[PDB]
From Swiss-Prot, chains A, B:
It comes from Enterobacteria phage N4. Assembles, to form an icosahedral capsid with a T=9 symmetry, about 60 nm in diameter, and consisting of 535 capsid proteins. The chain holds residues 102 to 151 of 401 of the full protein. It comes from the Viruses. This is Major capsid protein. It is found in: Virion.
Length: 50, 50
């Protein structure tokens, strides 16, 4: 019932349209840290602690 | 009875006049046409139709 049929006289028949879509995404921020003292390094048994 | 007879004393006698006529003519516009489809040419038995 929706086939674009055409007669020998043509005319303004079977017009169509188009569409488009948009996608999006965003970034975020992360981080963490730790703290220490000089003694916690110098007097510790393991010299490879850091 | 209407001859321009002139006497020995002349005078204001036998005066005449003249006339002219104007002719005219105009032009007119004519025309006619016919239509046809592509199928009436391509699918017709006779290729010399046009």
């Amino acid at each position: 019932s929706k086939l674009p049929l055409l007669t020998e006289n043509g005319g303004r028949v079977n017009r169509v349209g188009f569409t488009r879509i948009a996608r999006e995404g965003s970034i975020h921020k992360f981080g963490f840290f730790y703290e220490f003292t000089q003694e916690s390094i110098d007097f510790d048994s393991d010299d490879g602690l850091m």
